[model samples]
Target chain A: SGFRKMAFPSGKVEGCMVQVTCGTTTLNGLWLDDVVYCPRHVICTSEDMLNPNYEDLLIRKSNHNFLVQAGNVQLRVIGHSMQNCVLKLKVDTANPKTPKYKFVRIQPGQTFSVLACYNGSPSGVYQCAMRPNFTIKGSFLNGSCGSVGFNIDYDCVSFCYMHHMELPTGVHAGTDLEGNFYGPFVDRQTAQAAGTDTTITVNVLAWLYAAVINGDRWFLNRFTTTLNDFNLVAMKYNYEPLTQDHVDILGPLSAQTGIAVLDMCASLKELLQNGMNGRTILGSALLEDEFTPFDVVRQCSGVTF
Target chain B: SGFRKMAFPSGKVEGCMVQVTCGTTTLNGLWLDDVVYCPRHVICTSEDMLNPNYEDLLIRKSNHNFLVQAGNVQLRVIGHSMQNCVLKLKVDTANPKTPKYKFVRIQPGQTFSVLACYNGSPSGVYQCAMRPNFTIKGSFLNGSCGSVGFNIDYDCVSFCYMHHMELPTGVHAGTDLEGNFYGPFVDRQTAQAAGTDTTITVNVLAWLYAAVINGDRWFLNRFTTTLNDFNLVAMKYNYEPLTQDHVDILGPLSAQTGIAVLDMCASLKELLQNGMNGRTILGSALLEDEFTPFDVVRQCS
Candidate 1:
């Protein structure tokens, strides 16, 4: 009947975590109302633009506005900002002061990540915002909600003003570079049937000896990126811009709505930046339970994640 | 440039012995003067096959005129009579007397065995004659080289005869079910190529599993018989019956004699029987090194 909410599992366990289709060279996986894996422009592994752990993730399956999440935590990305700017988050307590900020680097991309509460910190709410103020001088800034008086808690990130989502590319689990869905649920019985060696998972060990001895060096670091799939009919869903097939398999994104809109245009970027701050401010305990600085900092160059 | 002679490895080891292509219902491995693992006939598995201190041994690769070895000696087993009447050898210190004699059961297939020489058994030169005229209702006979006065060394049991040889099946490594060459050297690349299971090993194992599961019920008895593998090409090569491609990949036979005959017909059987005796006599150590009464007795099903 209408757009609803739902909490989805990223399938994240130790050696087995979900790989998302955040943009092609960009990287990430899993999800949240709560777009995650955003070192820079997060690629939502879940398709149709949806997250499970929301206020109460629902589902009616229409197609429109997706209340996305982001923050002002001006993340100073140091590299080539390939796509537009991306989002980064800090749950429990990593200086939650600057709830929102913008990309002073305004370049291709940068490194990012946030840790959980430390030594003696309890659960804390989170907040986010856009370039609360632009800082070009030393390539840095930390405009917390309080520092800027943006009241992200009272204001919170709610970047769901419009309704838009990309259409399915017709390929079920398409990858950005064609055949590279090598981890977890990426069963290649079909791929094997299709006759291709590119989907070799560098880490999925069983094929190790078989791959090396059999001239499969062709799969160097190739099959790393996934597809950016905005495969939903309900609220709008944003997606990667690669071969429609592979594009739908890569990159990072937060929030899950089926609304439709072309790309992550400038205005929406502003809204998501603010919304991520508010959303995180409330459920900030992800520090101990979710990620570490190492995870955010660790990334590759090709499928780049 | 002509035919040369050589001793070969049966690939036979302790506990771990060989099996062969005997029909399917029966059981066991290869024969020398061949130990033709006969149907209804079986070679008992030697919980142990060691009995070396024998007196002496003999041989010849020529024909049925086997220069066989026996008793305090090593020798060939004669054909036909080699059937119903069998002899057991004893070395180390068993009564080296009546060195060679007829079996007590004396039937188509009977039980017989020997041990290492004993006390002061002289190196016995052996001899064999048809049934040696049994004596029970004359079923009993002690041709012990004396009945025929063929002159086997009399300090007695000192029996050594002219060398005798069973010709070669020309094969050295034959399998059990004709071509089921399923072991050791069997490779799987060819199995995969042939559209069988991925490997001969796989198919072979599955079959072994299936075989034991079936009346092995019978293999419990039959799988014991190893092929005498007259399977040699010349004098030392034994081969499988599967597709040549898969067979070579499976078993590792020694002798190399691919000269093929029509099949395992009676003619070839005779040649194999005498030939195996020759092969073993040359390596007389096979006594302690090879089998025992139980080995010959634990005949195939």
Candidate 2:
């Protein structure tokens, strides 16, 4: 006394044809349900034939299910055979259109669970048609039913799923001071924000280096006098870096390498007291880093005296 | 007592009107002596002329000389005088049927000198007919004769008169070991004689300097290693000043400073070691005297 019942609601078998275009060019149409077949018969008999043609016949009593052969019949299937039968599917859209399919054949004794989503020709629905057969016993015949299954769940939209999340903040704060320091000398913030300022601190620094290393009297006198003018303004504001409102003006201060600043001040003092010659007085200090005092002094002496 | 005697030899002035053509183009037709008063003297009066008519007086001097004077006066000369007075003098050769004295003009007081071997144009006897009063006195004074005693003896053949001497020998010596050389090195005798040798030397030197200084690896390698190359052959033999050759290769040698030579060798070695790299090695050692490795390295360090 084993119970026999057909699956309720019978799992729907409706399909739609999707047209695919590359950029603006059109591709071919796809017949989802047809061109797919599911076989559901244990034995082959002429009278046991069903609505769809039977491709192969196989029966598995352990699972009480019949296998249906579908597209790429070599594929193996496991699990439930209730949704495993043949179905007729077609792409009705026609005329100047590409070739369309009428129906797919599913064979008996073939697995349907091994079916995967189709990738060719408008790739949406994978269809299978159930094959029919009949068992005969001495003038009496028993009909076997086969069903087809459709699996349209596997599409590109379902593969790439990312959950919404927020990004971490405060990542750009300390990254500002990571590069090179080319300067006359100023607070980090002023140097960083000096894009608009044009007092040309780089030029002043260059001139100072030239005057010190090259003993160029003109550059020395000009930059020293200009710096002294700045010093006067500094004196007015108590010699604070903050009193300089012009960002460009601060660049020259930073550009004056430590040695250049010291030498310039000393030479200025000497000029004020003795009405100095154009000769560079702080020659040793200028050459202390890389160049020699002999070199700088020689150049300075050649020019001045 | 001074043994100074004056004799008048009458000269006949003849003219020829010849059409001078430049390719197919024809120049203007020139005229010989004509019986017309000079443009400067308009009125035919004694007071109007400052000088005597030596042409008529000279005819009275002798009948033998008179025939020469009639021959001179019969010729007519006409043409636009260029800024420089154009005096066309010609003798009436025996061919009168063709009228040999056709288009020749002689200025009033012009004299002629004979040329035994003249390489240029010929100056012949001319007729002093235009301003007769101004002609013979040697002072008809058409123009002021501006400054007297101007004493200018212009001999057109003077340029060829001086003797040409050979170039002094041993003017140049070869380069020193420091790569400082002198030249007109190769005795491009043909080129030197044609005055084109110096140009060749300049081009050769420019090429050598470019190779040596700019670190042209290929050229330097070929020049240094494969001495048989054409450029090397030219350089080696071009202007060996010390050698008794006529070529001057100093400009090229002087361009190859020690550092430049070293750089050239280094670049050649680099190329030999690693075929072609897209990068080129260019620096002061080749282009400028101030850029040296010692200077640059010290500065950079």
Candidate 1's error at A94, in angstroms? Answer: 15
lDDT of 2: 0.22
DockQ of 1: 0.01
Give one digit per residue, the lDDT tens place, for model 1 in B117-143. 111111111111111111100000111
State residue B16's C-alpha deviation in candidate 2, in Å. Answer: 83
Candidate 2 per-residue lDDT over residues B1-301, each given as its tens digit: 0000011111111121222221222221222233211111111134423353433432333212111122123332222121111112233432232222222232212222111001111111111111211111111111111100000022111100000111122111111111121223221122221121211222223333443433344434433322223233334433211211211333224444442333343333334355333332221111111122211221112
**lDDT at residue B174 of model 1 (Cα atoms):** 13
All candidates' lDDT scores? 0.18, 0.22
Determine which window of 10 residues in candidate 1 chain B has minimal summed lDDT.
B1-10
Number of the predicted model whose TM-score against the real structure is largest? 2
